[PDB]
Amino acid sequence: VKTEACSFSEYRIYPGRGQKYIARDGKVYFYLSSKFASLALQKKKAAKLRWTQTWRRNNKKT
Amino acid sequence: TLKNKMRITLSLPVGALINCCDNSGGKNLYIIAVQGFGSCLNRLPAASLGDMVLATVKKGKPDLRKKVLNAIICRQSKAWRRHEGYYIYFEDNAGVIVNPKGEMKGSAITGPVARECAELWPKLSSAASAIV
Amino acid sequence: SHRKFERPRHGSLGFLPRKRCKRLRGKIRSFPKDDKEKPPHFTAFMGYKAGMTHIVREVDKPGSKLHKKEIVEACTIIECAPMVVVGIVGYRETPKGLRILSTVWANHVSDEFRRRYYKNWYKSEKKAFTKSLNVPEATKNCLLKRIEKYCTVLRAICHTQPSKTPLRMKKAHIMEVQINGGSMKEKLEFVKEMLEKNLPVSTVFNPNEMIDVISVTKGHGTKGVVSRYGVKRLPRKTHRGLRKVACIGAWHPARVQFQIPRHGQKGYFHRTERNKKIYRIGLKTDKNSASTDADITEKKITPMGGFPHYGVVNEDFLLLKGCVAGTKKRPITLRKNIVPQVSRDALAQVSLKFIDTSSKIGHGRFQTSEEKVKYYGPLK
RNA sequence: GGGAUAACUGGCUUGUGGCUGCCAAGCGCUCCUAGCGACGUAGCUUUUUGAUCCUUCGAUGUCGGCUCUUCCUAUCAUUGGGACGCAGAAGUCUCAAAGUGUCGGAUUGUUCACCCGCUAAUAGGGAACGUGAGCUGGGUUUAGACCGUCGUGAGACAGGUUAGUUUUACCCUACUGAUGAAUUUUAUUAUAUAUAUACAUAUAGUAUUGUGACAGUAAUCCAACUUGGUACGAGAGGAUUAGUUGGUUCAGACAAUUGGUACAGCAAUUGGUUGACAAACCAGUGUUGCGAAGCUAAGUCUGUUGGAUAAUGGCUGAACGCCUCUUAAGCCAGAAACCAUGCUGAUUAAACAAUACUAUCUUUUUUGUUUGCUAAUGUAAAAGAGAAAUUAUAUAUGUACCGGUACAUA
RNA sequence: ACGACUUUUUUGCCUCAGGGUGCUGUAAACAUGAAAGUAAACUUUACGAUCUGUUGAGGCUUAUCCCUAGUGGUAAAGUGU
């Protein structure tokens, strides 16, 4: 029915906003922003990202 | 076979060096010309995924060096808008060599392949490990 | 001698002069033509461009590569306050063109109508339309009879209601609308009965219709030839400049051959965009106005944070397929096609899957403020 | 000193070059002419090279490329056709056609040339040998230098090579945009109550709505599939035609949404400095990371159909008992051409219409108009400025009958 | 560019402020919090890049963002006809 989830955040994927990267490994990575894309490009792990919901969950602050 | 193809953003100028993606023994493909390309003073010949290029082999088997051969692009660095509502792009640039009658010269396409291009050219869908 | 290699000329000769329009309001060049069998009806409407959104639509398109599968498309939103008819115009055919015989007015008019005539509404005694406050009803009837007898084209003098808008301007746009259909008498009866009422876009148009769009473009002032006409840029080596002009041309004419590209005005031009499909005609009192058969969720058309420089939608609105000429906030003129379009796409009936209401300021994901709050949770 | 005299344009001519002819001996199985066409012979042109020395030497900047626009047709392709040596598929000769298109490289000082490749095809020319106050300066062609040959020599060489300043628009016009008065020797396609009326109307000032003469113009080509492995063909092969879906080029917009963009703005960080500290500052934007928003494409949307026709295919049909597309009268259908339509402009019409309100003022009568000013005069046409059937033209108008018939009348 | 054009001039507008919308990424302050080690008492007391907590914190968001009849403001008084 309604659109899929972001997984980099809780968010629904609203169309147009997202872009898709297919890696050499055959792995797709779906980005909901340029900011997310740059983080991925610089290849920096989630466990250093104090702002993000995954970090908050990782440190059990939800 | 339908050969119809909805527009994909222009990419890969001639002189681009792209992966050969098969057990042909080619490692790279240097695209020297595009087949079907329009007339224009300004444009370099430019190719999307579904375009048939003409290439030469810069690294690869010795017979394949010098000689000109057709290819179809399978992996592409530049993003395009798929009508499903997202912009798709690949990590690398790659195509697979073929005949001027469109018969396959490869044996097995090692990387992933854009799905619209794979269903475009039957012999690539057959040979392809994964559909994008 | 002839050029070694051929190459099409830069820009269209047919849209010289590339100069400023003399009115903010769109100007209809020509109206829809004779159809006696059709009943009388309005041809045109002014509305304000509020912004753009995207849509998800399910596609039929027989034999297409996409075919059955769903598409995502850009769309324009035009807030449409109901226009009010205030006058009747009677035109007559002459070998010198259409000429007005007379105009007949309503029995009262708006302040907003009167504001358009006054340059200094604030510092005036507002005496317009006060001898012409009333005349005998016999005089009015005689003029109507006279117009029926002799006139062969009927237009209605209509005006915008900017008081139903957030915009700085309080002056109405006043406008002629041709009425196309049956006999002059049947038309006259139609305009008279309609007169003092307010016309929603739903009273003028049907969803799925193809529509012609009349507007002045977004400005940019005086610009160089590269920008204005798109010529190939100068070499790396030059005595002077790089956006500096090419050769003007031959010694014969011993004058500048006018077809040459030149520096000057770019944008604020009058332009007709053709055949834009109406994807939805929205309703003012609907709180579900952005929702779809797939979504079925209470949700107004207004974006998250509203439209840029316009905010909330509070009146009826037109959801139009694709691009529209001019700035956001600009009045935009809708006209019916001069001959009705006949095509697959014209005949086709739109089924939306989604209408976006996300932000258009930043990358604000959320459809609703409620969704944003729900994500974030507790606050200080 | 020199246009008394070259190199540059132009000009005359057109030998030379190019293009088109006429013909009929052969070739084309067979067959003059489907296609050809000699031996011969006629024209046209100046994108050739010459011949030339009228024009300019108190200077017209001396090649080419780049860039940019327009014109031509002697059409290469796209549109419509005609012929064929034509079964189809092709293909070949040909006509109306200049609406539209005619590319990427490799090698050159290069027009030219020559490969490789795409293309749908990669036609040919003009514009002061298109285009140096548009550029460039590689080349011929200043002064330095090198090698060969020739010259006793100094030196010489359309012999080859390297190095070598490209000055000024602020004028007038042009063009592009941007403002803008003013115009009763001027206008009027009607006005007034089913009837009138130029011997007549029209102030002006603001403001809205518009009129639209006139000027400009635009959309473009290809592919795929289905028709159809059918018609057609002995087989091999193998369509016209539509239809559907796509793509190229141009154009016009637009920025939802991707990308691009930062001296809006937060964070980080290098070197120094304010005692530390938070706070901060400085280094022509110190430097990074993110970056709304506004611009923008490599992102997104949109880009008519009538009329009159051309080539042509035909019809009725004479001259000429028959025949004949008219190489007589009368006609018809017919093209990317043409004109409207559409769209853009319209202080391109010293243009105009309708509407709204207003300026002690308008209207009728009398007398006057032989410190810049403060009573005030101008007419291009008075002399009876007299005169509203109408299709006509190898016949008209009434009237009577049912656009025709009959009867009058000019 | 400048004229010009679009507006509004108290059912407004400017102004700030609040909210919305966002953008950045968790401020200062404090922890007898954690922290590679260090030294000095007779197990206790010193020093310490850094990290976590208080803390989706702090900052910034019309300049050409949106909403608000929320605050205070809103003059000259000229000129042509």
Residue A33's contacts (CB-CB under 8 Å, 6 or more residues apart) are A17, C363
- Which 238-267 positions of C have CB less than 7 A from strand D? 238-240, 244, 246-252, 255-265, 267
Alpha-carbon distance C345 to C368, whole Å?
A: 33
Alpha-carbon distance C30 to C28, whole Å?
A: 6
Residues in a beta bridge with B130 = B112
**By C-alpha distance, which of C320, C322, C300 is closest to C311?**
C300
**Are β-strands B69-75 and B52-56 bridged in parallel, bridged antiparallel, or unpaired?**
antiparallel
User: Is C166's CB less than 7 Å from nucleic acid strand E?
Assistant: yes
Q: Resolution, in Å, please?
A: 4.7
What distance in Å separates residue B117's CA from the closest CA in chain C? Answer: 12
Q: How distant, in Å, are the alpha carbons of A53, B12, B69, C72, C317 from that of C81? A: 43, 50, 63, 28, 8
Radius of gyration (Cα) for chain B, nearest Å?
14
Helices (H) and strands (E) in chain C, counts: 6, 15
User: Is C57's CB less than 7 Å from nucleic acid strand D?
Assistant: no
**Residue C95 CA, nucleotide D394 C1', distance (Å):** 37
Experimental method: cryo-EM
Alpha-carbon distance A21 to A30, whole Å?
A: 6
**By C-alpha distance, which of C125, C134, C129 is closest to C110?**
C129
Please give the backbone phi and psi of residue B53, each rounded to the nearest 5 degrees, phi first: -95, 175
Are residues C159 and C174 in contact, defined by beta-carbon separation less than 8 angstroms? yes
Instruction: Tell me which H or E stretch contains C122.
Output: none
Instruction: Tell me which H or E stretch contains C353.
Output: strand C351-355
Q: Considering only CB atoms, which chain C residues are within 8 Å of A16?
A: 54, 72, 356
Give strand E nucleotides closer than 7 A to any protein Cβ: 1-2, 4-10, 12-13, 20-26, 52-58, 64-68
**What is the residue type of C48?**
Y
The SS3 call for residue A47 is helix
